[PDB]
Design a protein around this ligand. Structure first.
Ligand SMILES: Cc1[nH]ncc1-c1cc2nc([C@@H]3CC4CCN3CC4)[nH]c(=O)c2s1
Length: 386
């Protein structure tokens, strides 16, 4: 029964006090309705607990605790805010996830791996989570602000030379190796998930697609997940079923990245989704480089070494194959020390709320239930404090 005490005390454990308090709060939120209270059992419970549950919710970190400096991006499940915490006066990036949209889309699991990784990864390659908290309508993740913007915005503001791509590719490679070392494969690696810190250096940021590996480093996934341009043939095929693949599905995503960075378009671009999907399946035929956009044989070799079948893909035998590829040989940095060299683009920040490397941006609650629907159950255990 001291064994029990350990589980509760561990912030990594799904039955820690904050997750047990989520448990009581979500039960009271999903029972307290006129209809359900006709049930004695439910009235007896809500009479006993409802009052103290409100008192507790009082102390819980709220949205109003933060000033919203401005919006730096909008997802399908809601927006990411540059915010300043009122009390501490510290600046964060806060991601909102609409519980209504996640419930409605039958999509209320993706965030667990994302929270786990940002909360506990403790890597200089992984954007860091300080606070997860929820209210009746929203999930909140309060992360460190990455004021350098994403690479999608860098690549569209600069002609990127090989010397830059070497750097940015190496940092992505080390970042994924970090993610892999935590027993996770990422699956949706792309420039939108690659963020630049105050010093111009890279950090992975979106993790909704990440999956625990077997004891044998494989996964059984029968869902084709991640964004179409950057998805691997093996992951696309695995929608047809009997999906069984390892982390080499991420080295594909890097090859695609490297191609886009040097060529100027994705290598399997098409007008439709199903067009891009068709091209990717046919990658032995479909991949080729424009008769102009010039690329050193080393760069072109690495790309094609990455954009092959899983069985012969660079990084199957491990990440050191990648590291000692001719393309990466350079005078600026070694792999031991890259993240303390000078980045190709060091951002010009004016203040702690400068969001100039982010483009500008510019009503749907739940209905009262008939009987128990359990709308808050999918988010028991989210709440996290550092
Ligand atoms: C932590 C941090 N510091 N500075 C910026 C950021 C982040 C910004 C961001 N943006 C998104 C958005 C939502 C959808 C639409 C486009 N992006 C992908 C999905 N997702 C994310 O995880 C993150 S982290």
């Amino acid at each position: 029964q001291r064994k029990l005490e350990a589980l509760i005390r561990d912030p990594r454990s799904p039955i820690n006090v904050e997750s047990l308090l989520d448990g009581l709060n979500s039960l009271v939120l999903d029972l307290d309705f006129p209809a359900l209270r006709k049930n004695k059992n439910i009235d007896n419970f809500l009479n006993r607990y409802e009052k103290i549950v409100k008192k507790i919710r009082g102390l819980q970190m709220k949205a109003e605790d933060y000033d919203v400096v401005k919006v730096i991006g909008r997802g399908a499940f809601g927006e990411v805010q540059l915010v300043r915490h009122k009390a501490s006066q510290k600046v964060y990036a806060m991601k909102l996830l609409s519980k209504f949209e996640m419930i409605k889309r039958s999509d209320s699991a993706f965030f667990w791996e994302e929270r786990d990784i940002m909360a506990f990864a403790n890597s200089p390659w992984v954007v860091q989570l300080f606070y997860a908290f929820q209210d009746d309508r929203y999930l909140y993740m309060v992360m460190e602000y990455m004021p350098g913007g994403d690479l999608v915005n860098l690549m569209s503001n600069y002609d990127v030379p090989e010397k830059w791509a070497k750097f940015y590719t190496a940092e992505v490679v080390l970042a994924l190796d970090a993610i892999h070392s935590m027993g996770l494969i990422h699956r949706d690696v792309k420039p939108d998930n690659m963020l630049l810190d105050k010093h111009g250096h890279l950090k992975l940021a979106d993790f909704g697609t990440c999956m625990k590996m077997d004891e044998t480093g494989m996964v059984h996934c029968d869902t084709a997940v991640g964004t179409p341009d950057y998805i691997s043939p093996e992951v696309l095929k695995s929608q047809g079923g009997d999906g069984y693949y390892g982390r080499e599905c991420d080295w594909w995503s890097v090859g695609v990245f490297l191609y886009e960075m040097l060529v100027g378009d994705t290598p399997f671009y098409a007008d439709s989704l199903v067009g891009t999907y068709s091209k990717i399946m046919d990658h032995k035929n479909s991949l080729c480089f424009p008769e102009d956009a010039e690329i050193s044989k080393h760069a072109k070799n690495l790309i094609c070494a990455f954009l092959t079948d899983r069985e012969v893909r660079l990084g199957r035998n491990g990440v050191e194959e990648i590291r000692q590829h001719p393309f990466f040989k350079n005078d600026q940095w070694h792999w031991d020390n890259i993240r303390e060299t000078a980045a190709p683009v060091v951002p010009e920040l004016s203040s702690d709320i400068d969001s100039s490397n982010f483009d500008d941006i510019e009503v749907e609650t739940f209905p009262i239930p008939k009987a128990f629907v359990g709308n808050q159950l999918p988010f028991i255990g989210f709440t996290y404090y550092r």
